[PDB]
Write an enzyme that holds these catalytic residues in place. Structure first.
Site: not given
Length: 128
Positions: A45, A55-56, A75, A101, A118
């Site tokens: 991802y 963010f990641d 999530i 979140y 994502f």
């Protein structure tokens, strides 16, 4: 960018039809089957906030992320979205706070009431 594209163009794949998880298929998978709930799913991802900020990504660590599908280990948007995917598929998901979140967020990276983006590749899945 991609997050705005799925807001404008994404398919609503909730259940509740509340636009909480929107999807676009970017690459078609090679199998006809999705994973079953309970299956071990292996994904790559890349995650962005609504505004495009990364963010990641699992690709940085070259490490697939593994979870048991639909068991609440991730999530809500992931449990819902990955269940719609075929092996080898790449999709984009856009996920409202209720399916991510929520009001608390996950600071410092994820603010409260964040809609998250994502890109997810379903690498593989195995039986329960």
């Amino acid at each position: 960018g991609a997050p705005a594209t799925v807001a404008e163009q994404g398919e609503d794949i909730t259940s509740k039809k509340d636009r909480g998880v929107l999807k676009i298929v970017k690459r078609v998978g090679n199998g006809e089957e999705t994973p079953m709930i309970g299956d071990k799913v292996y994904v790559h991802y890349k995650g962005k906030l609504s505004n495009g900020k990364k963010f990641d990504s699992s690709h940085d660590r070259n490490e697939p992320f593994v979870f048991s599908l639909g068991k609440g280990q991730v999530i809500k948007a992931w449990d819902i979205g990955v269940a719609t995917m075929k092996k080898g598929e790449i999709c984009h998901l856009l996920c409202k706070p209720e399916y991510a979140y929520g009001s608390a967020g996950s600071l410092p990276k994820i603010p409260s009431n964040a809609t998250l983006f994502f890109e997810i590749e379903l690498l593989d899945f195995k039986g329960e």
